[PDB]
Design a binder for this molecule. Sequence first.
Ligand SMILES: *[C@@H]1O[C@H](CO)[C@@H](O[C@@H]2O[C@H](CO)[C@@H](O[C@@H]3O[C@H](CO[C@H]4O[C@H](CO)[C@@H](O)[C@H](O)[C@@H]4O)[C@@H](O)[C@H](O[C@H]4O[C@H](CO)[C@@H](O)[C@H](O)[C@@H]4O)[C@@H]3O)[C@H](O)[C@H]2NC(C)=O)[C@H](O)[C@H]1NC(C)=O
Ligand SMILES: *[C@@H]1O[C@H](CO)[C@@H](O[C@@H]2O[C@H](CO)[C@@H](O)[C@H](O)[C@H]2NC(C)=O)[C@H](O)[C@H]1NC(C)=O
Ligand SMILES: *[C@@H]1O[C@H](CO)[C@@H](O[C@@H]2O[C@H](CO)[C@@H](O)[C@H](O)[C@H]2NC(C)=O)[C@H](O)[C@H]1NC(C)=O
Ligand SMILES: *[C@@H]1O[C@H](CO)[C@@H](O)[C@H](O)[C@H]1NC(C)=O
Ligand SMILES: *[C@@H]1O[C@H](CO)[C@@H](O)[C@H](O)[C@H]1NC(C)=O
Ligand SMILES: *[C@@H]1O[C@H](CO)[C@@H](O)[C@H](O)[C@H]1NC(C)=O
Ligand SMILES: [Ca+2]
Ligand SMILES: [Ca+2]
Ligand SMILES: [Ca+2]
Ligand SMILES: [Ca+2]
Ligand SMILES: [Mg+2]
Lengths: 674, 1082
Amino acid sequence: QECTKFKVSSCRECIESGPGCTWCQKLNFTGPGDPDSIRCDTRPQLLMRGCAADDIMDPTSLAETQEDHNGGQKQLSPQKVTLYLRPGQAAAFNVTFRRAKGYPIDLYYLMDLSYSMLDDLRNVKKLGGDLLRALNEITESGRIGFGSFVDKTVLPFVNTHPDKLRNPCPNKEKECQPPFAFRHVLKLTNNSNQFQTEVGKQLISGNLDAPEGGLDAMMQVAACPEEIGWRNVTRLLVFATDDGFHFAGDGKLGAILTPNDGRCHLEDNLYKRSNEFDYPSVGQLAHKLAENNIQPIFAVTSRMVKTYEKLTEIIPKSAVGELSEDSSNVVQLIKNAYNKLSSRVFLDHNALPDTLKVTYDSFCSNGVTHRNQPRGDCDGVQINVPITFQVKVTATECIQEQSFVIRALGFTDIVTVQVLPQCECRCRDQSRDRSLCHGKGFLECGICRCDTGYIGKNCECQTQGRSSQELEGSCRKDNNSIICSGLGDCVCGQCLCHTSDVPGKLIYGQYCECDTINCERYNGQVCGGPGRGLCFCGKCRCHPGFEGSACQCERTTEGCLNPRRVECSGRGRCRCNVCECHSGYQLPLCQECPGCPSPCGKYISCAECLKFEKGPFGKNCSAACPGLQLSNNPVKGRTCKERDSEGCWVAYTLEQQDGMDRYLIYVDESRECV
Amino acid sequence: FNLDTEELTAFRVDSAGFGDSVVQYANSWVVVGAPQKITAANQTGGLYQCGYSTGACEPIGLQVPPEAVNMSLGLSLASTTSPSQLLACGPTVHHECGRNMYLTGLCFLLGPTQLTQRLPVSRQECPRQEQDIVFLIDGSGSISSRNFATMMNFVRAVISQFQRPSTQFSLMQFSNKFQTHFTFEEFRRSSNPLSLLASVHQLQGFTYTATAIQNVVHRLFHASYGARRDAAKILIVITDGKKEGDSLDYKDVIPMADAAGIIRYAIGVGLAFQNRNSWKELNDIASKPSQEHIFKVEDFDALKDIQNQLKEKIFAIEGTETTSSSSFELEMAQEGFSAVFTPDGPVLGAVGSFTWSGGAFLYPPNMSPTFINMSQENVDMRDSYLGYSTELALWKGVQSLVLGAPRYQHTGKAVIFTQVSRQWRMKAEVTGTQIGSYFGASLCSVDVDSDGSTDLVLIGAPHYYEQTRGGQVSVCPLPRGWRRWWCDAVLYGEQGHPWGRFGAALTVLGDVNGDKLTDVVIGAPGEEENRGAVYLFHGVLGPSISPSHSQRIAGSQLSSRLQYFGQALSGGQDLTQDGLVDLAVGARGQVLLLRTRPVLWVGVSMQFIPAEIPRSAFECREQVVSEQTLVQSNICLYIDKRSKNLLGSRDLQSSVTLDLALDPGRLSPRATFQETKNRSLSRVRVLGLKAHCENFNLLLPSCVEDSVTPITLRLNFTLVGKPLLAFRNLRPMLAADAQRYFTASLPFEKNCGADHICQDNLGISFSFPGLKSLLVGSNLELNAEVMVWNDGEDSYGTTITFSHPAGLSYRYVAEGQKQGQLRSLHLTCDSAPVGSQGTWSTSCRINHLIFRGGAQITFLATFDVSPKAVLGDRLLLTANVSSENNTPRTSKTTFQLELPVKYAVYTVVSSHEQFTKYLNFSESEEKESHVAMHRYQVNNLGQRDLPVSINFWVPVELNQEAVWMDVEVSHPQNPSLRCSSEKIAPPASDFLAHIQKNPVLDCSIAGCLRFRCDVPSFSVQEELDFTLKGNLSFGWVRQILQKKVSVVSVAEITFDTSVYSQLPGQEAFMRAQTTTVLEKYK
Ligand SMILES: *[C@@H]1O[C@H](CO)[C@@H](O[C@@H]2O[C@H](CO)[C@@H](O[C@@H]3O[C@H](CO[C@H]4O[C@H](CO)[C@@H](O)[C@H](O)[C@@H]4O)[C@@H](O)[C@H](O[C@H]4O[C@H](CO)[C@@H](O)[C@H](O)[C@@H]4O)[C@@H]3O)[C@H](O)[C@H]2NC(C)=O)[C@H](O)[C@H]1NC(C)=O
Ligand SMILES: *[C@@H]1O[C@H](CO)[C@@H](O[C@@H]2O[C@H](CO)[C@@H](O)[C@H](O)[C@H]2NC(C)=O)[C@H](O)[C@H]1NC(C)=O
Ligand SMILES: *[C@@H]1O[C@H](CO)[C@@H](O[C@@H]2O[C@H](CO)[C@@H](O)[C@H](O)[C@H]2NC(C)=O)[C@H](O)[C@H]1NC(C)=O
Ligand SMILES: *[C@@H]1O[C@H](CO)[C@@H](O)[C@H](O)[C@H]1NC(C)=O
Ligand SMILES: *[C@@H]1O[C@H](CO)[C@@H](O)[C@H](O)[C@H]1NC(C)=O
Ligand SMILES: *[C@@H]1O[C@H](CO)[C@@H](O)[C@H](O)[C@H]1NC(C)=O
Ligand SMILES: [Ca+2]
Ligand SMILES: [Ca+2]
Ligand SMILES: [Ca+2]
Ligand SMILES: [Ca+2]
Ligand SMILES: [Mg+2]
């Protein structure tokens, strides 16, 4: 199959060469004056040479599925995978996951209390008897909690004196509560009517800056249930606000450069730290949040729908809910929650050491035959239909025995996957044959490994003073080659490559022909430095995730992808995280061709065939006008403005998108026949 | 890689938020910031200047005005060098405008001059609200004379509670007629307005409610009477009955009033109103909602009990159209949040401009300042803090500013602005990569080289990730030619440590290692367990940085106990006055200074006086002696790259340890030095910028086994001692690429037989397979197919060297999986500078095997060539070929060839959209002049100035019938250039049918007109544009007997096909077109 020889001194050093490397233990396999490194070839070659089949030591990777009894864990099996992983060779173990039933639920209503959330507070202050009613079907005795939030106390997030601070309410001043940021009004409780009545109590507040500081509330919530309390099963949250959201970095405005610690420190179910404390970074949730098995459910105005949409991409288990400004269709959010929240099966793992690389496969239930990618994104599975993930773990070197875990994001089920460095190849010891190797050496699967001072295939020679006539036979690759390719003095048939005390430098091989320094460079580093790849006799063996002549095309990834998740938009192969845009399309993702004519001609005919109805000319339209979209919105960019079929100047912008002649227009509701 | 981590200075002044923001001041000092250094009543912080001489920080004197409150100065800092000045800021000034205070910002300019204080210190006064209230009163006969003086007494009352000129009043009374007692003009002018209130008398009479209302808003609310134009219109009414005899109706009056936007209140008296026939005239009268703008009463006397209530409803007035939204201007813009200088005055940044869009205020030389937002026509950019960070971008031409917008669409975009003469528009921009990434936090214009023209720009995004949340900095060069610009000339540096906040800050450090390639520093106070961290990168060639950093001085460097360090940092100035630049990095509590240790590197030459071995002490013999032969080996050492350290002390003297060793890798020493008798030796000797050559004695034993393999001699060398006169160098060192292991070979006179004399005969020849034209830009790699002979004795360590211009070097091919009639070959190549000025040799000895008999062999050697390859209009290259046994004789066998070289250029041309497509039906006669205008814009994104000549093709004559006459070409915004003119006649085919196919009128039909506008030197980036016009005749339109015809002009740019070409393969962007239409019917 494949096997390039690294320094081969024992059967183990043959294994550390690659997956397709096998070793022969059969004695008397070495000819009159043949190398010991010949014992290490490919299984096929060994048989062609004569090496018996049962003499081919071949440590291969496999899996130990120690399945539990039951109620060990529920729908993630197996529960304990003890893999024996040989470097370079991939071990594959499957993962059966058949979600079963709805466990105890635990909701929490994060509502922004502003003057814009007035009729929201009215049409919601006490509609919770239909929440348990909407909870009745699937889950049983769940829990219900509430938490309010506005924005940081101190400016510039809201005027900090004066007694508008005691009275922020704009114009009505209906005794609204003091400006706050997070008030834990209700704890997770069984009752439902007590919950409603404790809510209506509190009235709104107000702040200055338009977007909110709701992110600070997020952490403070799932930070210390030593005072808030939380169920040990499920934990769903729901964001609600007709306003933006502030993240880290914005605190510098309020003269606060103390980052977010992660733990909440309240004394009266109310924050008094958010002031002496900076905003939680955007990414400080997908970690902490997803660590406590909590998952918000975005539900805001249509004005803020596609901003939280981009937020759905990043953080896991999160849905987008466009609703009216009255919060009346808020309970239908959760009919859309379990819809695609019980659907996102995840299968990531604890941050593994760099010495390892993990991947997965996917076999969704409705049709999908995925292969080779992290995660386990199958947005088409729900109640009681199992799934299939093929976890393939590979190593680069002979790891040290350790252990990691593969969890499902948003699930308490831990799968303790044990990992064992499988390399050594037991065979014999130095009780059998202290004879051969002339007493000054031991034996290991045939060959003999001599002492510091003895060398030779039978420890017959010593590392001082030796040489013969035709022992220099297999000591040179061919008749017209210099002995040991220089940089190596031949002793007893074979060669002993000289040593260089220079970083990296190392000679090796039967005739000392290969080195670990003379390969293809990259960024002023050998085979891409020790990070990217390595050097071995000219060719670079790039680490996992890196390909190319010298790991030049450093990443096998595709940063050539945009949010559209189509490579290089229109045209351009994705080589080395770079697009090769056809024509004059420019970088990085090939969308704008600055020099292009920005053609509006030939488009007028179809512009009046879509917005206005002034006759699809050549034929009809939607056929001669595959600029299929005509959004009812202020799209922009290619601001065009030409005339119509008969006189009038028809205005319209023209936002191109992705491939070939695909477009998106808004034709101004106006004309000009002057 | 030369940032001191031992002997540095540390200022630990414990003053709260001390060491939170820092900057390099006039070289002698460093200024630190402590925003939270409480002073007085919740006021400022304070600054500190620190000198190197004595490790101590002295407070800095400041005249903090009582006006500026809780501004916590020092938070934002900035310093210039032109003339040395410094700038600090309190971006949190608090000025109490009553109801609610805001944030304005206040800065100070210090230096060896006058202590200026610039916004400039017009203590930013609160906002003035404009109200134009109009009292309307029923004076019908139903009201008693007693209830009258009481009501007009309540009127004056509600007038005093207000203050002018920010408020205004106008009164009218309405019964059966309508008297305007005093207008808006007679209120702001009359020093005593209430003097006219007690002057009015009752009217009695009938009642026409609605009628007066119109007589009020269509007169008193005119800008003519004095009612301010841009104002808030309020109207109040006080009546005791409905409208009877009122010849009008509310169905006409109410609408047109709400048009001008007039909030309507109502105050009734009688309680006859609480009937269902007199309650609707309070709702109709007032403006929606009805339950807010009304306050009915029974008694005129206790009408002043609600005098206490009306206080509020009117003051709370802000704006009622878009459901009471929240707009702004410059109340909480905290100007000076981030500042940076520039040849034409400093530049502070505002954040809360309007919809918190953002911007920056520029201050010229005592001329009033300007300001740059994004205009309002820019719908987006709401809440982005445009100007959170600010940086300059000087260029050979005009300056350019840059503002950071962390939260554009909540992701983060960065926008670059230019200030063209009477323009100040936007150059370009780039969105962020991820939501919350915060793309825009930090920015730094840096200079890969030292040409003085800012080449590229860094960007910060500490809170970004995909799997690991280390942070993210983004390199983004500064392409010229607006509307195109990419933060992706590839790369973006990071680190393998989540929650690190990498990119929090950064500054240009400049040339530290002396390879002409500026180097930058970058902070990351979140690394490790909250511990601090900093990074060091280097440039390469033009727009680029090296992802792999050389150093990573973090908070584990016996920084006993600081939590997050690197928050901010600025360097580039020599303050310790030990020659080279210094770096200042702020940290919580204290701030450190890391100097840069001098990096010199050295070149070496090795040789063996006796070239090879004469076979005298070769195979030897055993009667009598070892006459141990005496080989001499001379090595020399000299340092050449110096520019930074300059002549004189240190750049010269520097002792060194030498460690020579022969045949190291083998346990069979082939020789020994005489001085020590060992197989190796060491001696410490003095170096200089002038060579130091010493030859040593070597002893070869008469008899030896291996002779084929030359004997190696390598040296390990370093820099021992490091005492040099004063301690003003302290520690010098070597660079990254330190090939401290240099080896030279000594061959042997191989036995080519008991006779036959060993004739060295080798030839050589090479070519370039498929190499077409070779222009600099394309054809980066250069594939050379070299063949070689051996028509003589066997060459063992045969070597093959090339001569080439500086613009290229050899890179290993490493091709394989299985292909060739070709290379197979492990060979060792070493580049090196040779000739006087320019050329140099890359030798390549076929390392480890023999080249025998009349055998030929072919291998492939490839040379990367730089896109900016300085080389003549022709490039030659040669190939010396010889054996290991050197060249014992006369005429060399070199092989050379010379190639024509060209150079890449990007040259594009567009048809500006100011183009006259004008067809329309009014075509009664054959007139002349509706001159059309074909504007063509052109520009080159190449990288070299190159002459050009822009050609044109404008139709005119058409069978004697002119198409459009007197056509010339204007060249505005540029000198009067010379253009040529020539007429030509097309092929003359049947044009009848020709354009019937296509209404087009290209030059192939009508006698066209070529314009050859030459150009002296089309400097890169130059968008040299120009247009052409001419009265367009309608006569020829009939000549062809159709309608809706269209005439086209072609414009093609040209340049010397030789020397220059265009790069990508083939782009026709150098040939634009403009099609005008002459559809005129009837
Ligand atoms: C920098 O950025 C801004 C904002 O992004 C650009 O656009 C400005 O946007 C504001 C929007 O509020 C424009 O509004 C101005 O309002 C002033 C007073 O408030 C009036 O408007 C509100 C809303 O209708 C009313 O409710 C209130 O009662 C007031 O009527 C006006 O005084 C402004 O000036 C206008 O009238 C004055 C009369 O003195 C004229 O001199 C001006 O020409 C102007 O017509 C204005 O209406 C504001 O117009 C915008 N500025 C500009 C210059 O257009 C800015 O364009 C941008 N700045 C620059 C220099 O580019
Ligand atoms: C500045 O204002 C702050 C509060 O914003 C003061 O801090 C304390 O505030 C509380 C609540 O108003 C007062 O009851 C305390 O008396 C304040 N503490 C002290 C020690 O006075 C702070 O005092 C003010 N600082 C100054 C010097 O004016
Ligand atoms: C030049 O090179 C040799 C080998 O690197 C130095 O010898 C030391 O040898 C040991 C291994 O036997 C290395 O671990 C050390 O790094 C080497 N030097 C030390 C102590 O750092 C030798 O010292 C060098 N010659 C000099 C003195 O410049
Ligand atoms: C895992 O599942 C796939 C597809 O069902 C199957 O082909 C493969 O054999 C399974 N792997 C193991 C280890 O059983
Ligand atoms: C002499 O030779 C030995 C072995 O090569 C070496 O270790 C030692 O350093 C040498 N001594 C001197 C004085 O050079
Ligand atoms: C090859 O060319 C270089 C050019 O300077 C010269 O130094 C060298 O002697 C040449 N080699 C031989 C021996 O032909
Ligand atoms: Ca609402
Ligand atoms: Ca530069
Ligand atoms: Ca440098
Ligand atoms: Ca210095
Ligand atoms: Mg009356």
